[PDB]
Every structure is written in structure tokens, then in C-alpha cells.
Amino acid sequence: ARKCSLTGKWTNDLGSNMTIGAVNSRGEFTGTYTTAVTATSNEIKESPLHGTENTINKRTQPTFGFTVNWKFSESTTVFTGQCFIDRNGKEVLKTMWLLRSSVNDIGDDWKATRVGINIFTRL
Amino acid sequence: ARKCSLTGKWTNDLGSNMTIGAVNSRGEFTGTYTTAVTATSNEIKESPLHGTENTINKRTQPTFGFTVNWKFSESTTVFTGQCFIDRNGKEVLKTMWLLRSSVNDIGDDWKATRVGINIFTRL
Amino acid sequence: ARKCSLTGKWTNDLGSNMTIGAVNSRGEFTGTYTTAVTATSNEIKESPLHGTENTINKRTQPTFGFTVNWKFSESTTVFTGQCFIDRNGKEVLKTMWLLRSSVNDIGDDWKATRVGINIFTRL
Amino acid sequence: ARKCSLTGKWTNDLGSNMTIGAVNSRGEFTGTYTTAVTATSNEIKESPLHGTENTINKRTQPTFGFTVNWKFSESTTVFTGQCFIDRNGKEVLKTMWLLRSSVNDIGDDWKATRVGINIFTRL
Ligand SMILES: NC1=c2[nH]c(=O)n([C@@H]3C[C@@H](O)[C@H](CO)O3)c2=NCN1
Ligand SMILES: NC1=c2[nH]c(=O)n([C@@H]3C[C@@H](O)[C@H](CO)O3)c2=NCN1
Ligand SMILES: NC1=c2[nH]c(=O)n([C@@H]3C[C@@H](O)[C@H](CO)O3)c2=NCN1
Ligand SMILES: NC1=c2[nH]c(=O)n([C@@H]3C[C@@H](O)[C@H](CO)O3)c2=NCN1
Ligand SMILES: *[C@@H]1O[C@H](CO)[C@@H](O)[C@H](O)[C@H]1NC(C)=O
Ligand SMILES: *[C@@H]1O[C@H](CO)[C@@H](O)[C@H](O)[C@H]1NC(C)=O
Ligand SMILES: *[C@@H]1O[C@H](CO)[C@@H](O)[C@H](O)[C@H]1NC(C)=O
Ligand SMILES: *[C@@H]1O[C@H](CO)[C@@H](O)[C@H](O)[C@H]1NC(C)=O
Numbered sequence: 001a002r003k004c005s006l007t008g009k010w011t012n013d014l015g016s017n018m019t020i021g022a023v024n025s026r027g028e029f030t031g032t033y034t035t036a037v038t039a040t041s042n043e044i045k046e047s048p049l050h051g052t053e054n055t056i057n058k059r060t061q062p063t064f065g066f067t068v069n070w071k072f073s074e075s076t077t078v079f080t081g082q083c084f085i086d087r088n089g090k091e092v093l094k095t096m097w098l099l100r101s102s103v104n105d106i107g108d109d110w111k112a113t114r115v116g117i118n119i120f121t122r123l
Numbered sequence: 124a125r126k127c128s129l130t131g132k133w134t135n136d137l138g139s140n141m142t143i144g145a146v147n148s149r150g151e152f153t154g155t156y157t158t159a160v161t162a163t164s165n166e167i168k169e170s171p172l173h174g175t176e177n178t179i180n181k182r183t184q185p186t187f188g189f190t191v192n193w194k195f196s197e198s199t200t201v202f203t204g205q206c207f208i209d210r211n212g213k214e215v216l217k218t219m220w221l222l223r224s225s226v227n228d229i230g231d232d233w234k235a236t237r238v239g240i241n242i243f244t245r246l
Numbered sequence: 247a248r249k250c251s252l253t254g255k256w257t258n259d260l261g262s263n264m265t266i267g268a269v270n271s272r273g274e275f276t277g278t279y280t281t282a283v284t285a286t287s288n289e290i291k292e293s294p295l296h297g298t299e300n301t302i303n304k305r306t307q308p309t310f311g312f313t314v315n316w317k318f319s320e321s322t323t324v325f326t327g328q329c330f331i332d333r334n335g336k337e338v339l340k341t342m343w344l345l346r347s348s349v350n351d352i353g354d355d356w357k358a359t360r361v362g363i364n365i366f367t368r369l
Numbered sequence: 370a371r372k373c374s375l376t377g378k379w380t381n382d383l384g385s386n387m388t389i390g391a392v393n394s395r396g397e398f399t400g401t402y403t404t405a406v407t408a409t410s411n412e413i414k415e416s417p418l419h420g421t422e423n424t425i426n427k428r429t430q431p432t433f434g435f436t437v438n439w440k441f442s443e444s445t446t447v448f449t450g451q452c453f454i455d456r457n458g459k460e461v462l463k464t465m466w467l468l469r470s471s472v473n474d475i476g477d478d479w480k481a482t483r484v485g486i487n488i489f490t491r492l
Contacts, residue, residue: 014479027192028173050151050175052192054199054225063223065190065201069150069175076177078188078201080223082235094229096221096236096361098484100186100203102177109217110383112205115238115342115467115484117363137356219484222357233260234345238361238465240486273438274419296397298419298438300445300471309469311447313434315396315421322423324434324447326469328481340478344465346432346449348423352463358451359465361484 004061004083004091006053009123015041017123018049027053033068045072051079061085074102079118093120127184127206127214129176133243140246141172150176156191170194174202184208197225202241216243250307250329250337252299256366263369264295273299279314293317297325307331320348325364339366373430373452373460375422378492384410386492387418396422402437414441420448430454443471448487462489 006029011017020031031049036042051066065080081095099114129143129152143154156170174189188203204218222237252266252275266277279293297312311326327341345360375398380386389400400418405411420435434449450464468483 056197063199065199067188074179076186076188078203080201080221084229094232098203106207302443309445311436311445320425322432322434324449326447326467330475344449352453355463
């Protein structure tokens with residue numbers, strides 16, 4: 001009964017939000033990612049995401065990955081992590097991400113990758 | 124300087140291979156990821172991948188990300204990186220990945236993410 | 247805005263604790279890292295750490311790195327991050343770490359590095 | 370007889386060089402790190418490093434960590450990895466690093482960490 005499900009509306013520790021739709025039988029899902037300029041805030045861009053959740057042993061707490069294809073930049077971010085629960089109740093996504101910037105010369109590749117985390121909860 | 128195109132067959136610094144199909148107008152692509160060794164032999168599994176290439180400014184050396192949904196484990200890997208024309212003229216994908224393992228308790232989350240790199244050239 | 251000083255006793259989001267001593271004029275410091283749980287109990291090991299704080303522009307919120315030389319394993323961890331005065335006034339260390347495991351064959355190197363984060367507040 | 374030893378002069382895949390001195394009985398060592406501006410090259414800065422190598426089971430291929438306290442910036446880099454050998458002969462250090470930039474507001478923390486690799490060989 002305690003299936004952690006990616007589908008729905010999520011927010012995070014930096015105040016970014018994401019929506020993910022139905023995950024099919026192969027574990028594929030699409031979504032949207034907002035973001036989060038200045039002021040507030042400032043004002044919001046919306047970016048597409050595509051990923052897969054791992055279906056091996058139809059786990060209640062599966063691992064997943066997804067790519068955010070940023071609309072306001074040449075950058076790409078990948079997130080990977082796991083859907084947990086958590087003492088009710090509360091579903092939580094613990095992710096790690098890599099943010100790739102575009103560089104012009106391959107000589108600059110070494111500096112093009114940031115890493116960090118995101119914890120997501122239901123909105 | 125012409126394009127660096129993700130479509131085709133690639134190999135990497137650890138001897139794994141990947142094939143990527145056409146990238147559509149939204150930057151989407153599917154493919155396959157063939158890995159090893161674990162032997163002796165018992166060699167080659169084949170896992171699906173799905174990703175997107177960034178299209179902002181229709182760059183000749185775009186960034187991209189993809190998720191590999193492992194068939195032989197509960198794990199997921201995400202790659203992100205950039206398609207370069209190396210100094211020598213050859214196309215090269217410089218990537219970094221995050222390999223997420225499935226843990227049973229959210230207390231074991233801290234240890235679930237490996238990181239590394241992969242450099243891909245055409246087969 | 248006053249200093250953010252590494253010297254003192256810290257705790258973190260996973261319940262591990264660390265003590266750091268004086269930082270000398272070159273930015274050097276030693277300390278201790280107390281971790282757990284592995285139980286039941288069999289609880290607390292104590293491992294040495296050694297690091298440096300960056301002193302360029304004698305910043306109030308300097309960056310730093312340190313290496314923890316684990317006593318109970320062959321592994322090494324490195325932390326790096328920054329000492330902030332949080333919005334609430336409290337000192338906080340935001341860090342990222344790389345946990346390197348010992349492997350026997352250089353063919354197993356690709357899998358030897360975990361990554362994550364730790365947020366430290368004063369005990 | 371095949372002890373991989375950190376002490377000496379090393380170069381890397383980006384053309385940076387490092388010298389490390391004697392490692393004591395607790396595994397501590399100091400060194401220097403050059404770097405590598407422009408042109409060539411361009412011209413070289415030299416930065417101090419401090420780290421430890423793990424002594425548990427006096428391994429022939431120990432893991433280590435070290436911090437580079439950059440002299441020309443507010444940044445800090447930590448490297449961790451392992452000293453291998455390799456079919457002679459050839460000692461090789463396979464490292465992963467995190468490069469922390471200084472940011473002014475904790476709101477900007479999420480973007481302050483780059484990750485990458487370095488392979489080092491004897492000069
Ligand atoms: N300017 C950019 C950003 N500003 C921001 O809050 N993000 C968020 C924060 C972090 O959740 C995730 C990393 O790519 O995306 C940005 N990504 C990419 N580029
Ligand atoms: N046992 C596993 C592996 N053995 C292997 O070579 N790989 C490769 C190497 C790396 O490209 C990619 C995930 O990092 O998959 C494995 N991934 C996941 N699991
Ligand atoms: N078994 C190990 C551990 N259990 C643990 O809580 N840690 C902590 C968590 C993290 O702060 C730091 C290395 O990542 O050490 C361990 N490190 C290394 N090995
Ligand atoms: N401007 C900077 C650099 N230019 C450079 O080549 N490096 C090198 C490359 C990479 O080996 C290591 C990462 O900090 O240090 C720099 N580090 C830090 N800052
Ligand atoms: C996230 O959604 C919440 C709920 O409506 C909203 O208050 C906030 O504006 C959102 N943040 C962003 C970046 O859109
Ligand atoms: C990768 O491709 C080559 C063909 O060039 C094949 O012979 C090799 O064994 C492949 N490796 C894997 C793991 O499939
Ligand atoms: C950390 O510090 C507290 C004292 O505030 C101590 O009671 C706690 O159990 C410590 N944790 C570890 C792992 O030492
Ligand atoms: C590394 O040392 C070599 C050997 O002398 C030298 O050619 C090169 O100038 C060095 N690179 C840097 C960044 O100092």
C-alpha cells in the first residue's frame with residue numbers, strides 16, 4: 001500500500017517546483033520544472049523534463065533519473081535519486097544533480113559541471 | 124566547424140558502448156546502453172536510455188543529459204555533458220554521471236550516490 | 247556582519263560531530279570527526295581531520311577544505327564548503343564531500359567515489 | 370615491493386603539476402600545486418596543499434585526500450582518490466575533486482561547487 005509515486009506536484013528546499021505526469025509501464029515520465037529568477041523570486045521560467053524510474057522488483061521506493069532541458073539557457077541538468085516514505089504519510093524525493101554548462105572550447109570542459117542536492121516534498 | 128551530433132554509435136573509456144537514435148525537434152532521443160564485464164564472462168546486458176539535448180541557440184556543440192534505467196539492477200544512472208569537436212577534429216562526448224543505488228532505509232541515503240566520468244568516441 | 251570561524255564544535259544533519267581547533271595564520275587547522283551508528287550500538291569512532299581555510303581577502307565567510315582520514319576503514323573523505331552567517335544570524339557550514347573507497351584493482355576505480363553534502367551548526 | 374608512494378613530482382591530464390614531500394607516520398603530507406593560467410599556459414601560480422593518506426592495513430595502494438588552498442582566488446579545492454600500479458612500473462593517481470567557489474549570499478550556495486577528475490603520473 002506504501003508505493004512512493006513520482007506523479008504529481010513537488011516543491012524543493014530552494015523553492016523550485018516541478019510537475020510530473022503519469023509514469024507508464026516502462027517507467028517513463030515527462031514533466032515541467034519551475035524556477036525561480038530573482039526578487040521573490042523575480043519571475044518564473046518553465047522547462048521540460050524527461051526521465052525514467054527503475055522498475056526492477058517493482059519496488060515501493062524506486063530510484064529514478066531525469067533530465068531538465070533548460071529553456072532560458074544552453075545548460076542541462078540531470079537529477080537522480082530515490083522516492084522514500086517516511087513515517088505516515090510523507091513521501092520525499094532525495095536527489096542529487098549535475099548541472100552542465102556549455103563551454104566554447106573543450107579546454108574549458110573541466111569547469112563545466114556543478115553538483116548538488118535537492119530534497120522534494122509534495123506541494 | 125560543423126555539427127556534433129549525438130545520433131550514432133559510441134564507445135567509452137571503460138569499454139561500454141551506446142547507441143543513440145534520432146534527436147527530434149524538441150531535443151529528445153532514445154537509445155541503448157551496453158555494459159560489462161563481471162567475469163570470466165557472463166558478459167553483456169543492454170539497458171534503455173532516454174534523454175534530451177539542449178537546443179537553445181542551436182549550438183554546434185550542445186549540452187545534453189540522459190538517464191539509464193538499468194535492466195540488471197535497481198539502480199539508475201544519469202549522464203550529462205557536452206558534444207565537442209575535439210582539437211583533432213573528432214567528435215567527442217565529455218560526460219559526468221551520477222549512479223544512484225537503491226537503499227532500503229532513508230537513513231542510508233547519504234551513501235547511495237556515486238559520481239564519475241565518461242568520455243565517448245564514435246565506434 | 248562579524249566573522250564565521252571554523253574553530254569550535256560542530257554537529258550535522260546526520261548526527262555526526264566534529265571539533266576543529268585554532269586556525270593558524272596560513273589557514274591551517276586540525277580537529278576530530280566523530281561519526282556513527284552501526285547498531286544496535288557499537289557506536290562512536292573518532293578520526294583525525296586536517297584542512298585549510300582560504301585567507302584571500304580575509305573574508306568573513308571563507309571557503310575551506312579538509313580531509314578525514316578514517317580510523318575504522320581504508321577510506322578517505324574530503325569536505326569542502328563555506329562558512330556562512332545564515333539569514334537568521336547563526337553560523338553554518340555548507341559542505342560537500344567526496345568519500346573514496348579503497349578498491350583492489352584499478353579496473354574498479356570508476357565505482358570508488360561517493361558524493362554528498364553536510365550542513366553543520368554549532369553544538 | 371610495490372608500494373605506491375605520494376611523495377614526489379606529479380603532472381596531470383590538464384597539464385597542472387604538483388609536488389608532495391615526505392608523508393610522515395600519521396600519513397600527513399604537504400605540497401605545492403601549479404597551475405596554469407592562459408596562453409601556454411600563460412603564467413604559473415603556485416599554491417599550498419595539505420592532506421593525509423590513509424594508513425589502515427598499510428596498503429600498497431592507499432586512498433588519500435588533500436586540500437588546495439588557492440593563492441590567486443577565494444576558492445578551495447579538495448582532491449580524493451587512490452595511488453595505483455599498474456603494469457611495471459607506472460604509478461598513477463586517480464582522483465576526484467570538488468572545487469568550491471566563494472559566494473556572497475548563502476542563497477547562492479547551491480551553485481558553488483564544481484566536480485571533476487584528475488589523473489596524475491610521475492613527471
Ligand atoms: N540559473 C539556473 C538556476 N537557478 C536555479 O535556481 N536553478 C535550480 C536550482 C537547482 O535546483 C537546480 C540545479 O540545476 O535548478 C537553476 N538551474 C540552472 N540554471
Ligand atoms: N554493475 C554496474 C556497472 N558496471 C559497469 O561497468 N557500469 C557502467 C559504467 C558507467 O558507465 C555506467 C554507470 O556509471 O555503467 C555499471 N553501472 C551500473 N552497475
Ligand atoms: N561507514 C562510514 C560512515 N558512516 C557514516 O555515518 N559516515 C559519515 C557521513 C559523512 O559525513 C562522512 C563521510 O561522508 O562520514 C561514514 N563515513 C565513512 N564510512
Ligand atoms: N582558475 C582555476 C583553475 N584553473 C585550473 O586549471 N585549475 C585546476 C584544474 C583542476 O585540476 C583543478 C580543480 O580545482 O585545478 C583551477 N582550479 C581553480 N581555479
Ligand atoms: C512554487 O509553487 C508555489 C505554490 O503555489 C508558489 O507559491 C511559488 O510561487 C512557486 N515557486 C516558483 C519558483 O514558481
Ligand atoms: C563495444 O563495441 C565493440 C565493437 O567495436 C565490441 O566488440 C565490444 O566488445 C563492445 N563492448 C561491449 C561491452 O559491448
Ligand atoms: C554529537 O553531540 C551530542 C552532544 O550534543 C552527543 O550527545 C551526540 O550523541 C553526538 N553524536 C555523535 C555521533 O557523537
Ligand atoms: C609542468 O612541469 C613541466 C615540466 O617542466 C613544464 O613543462 C610545465 O611548464 C609545467 N606546467 C605548469 C602549469 O607549470
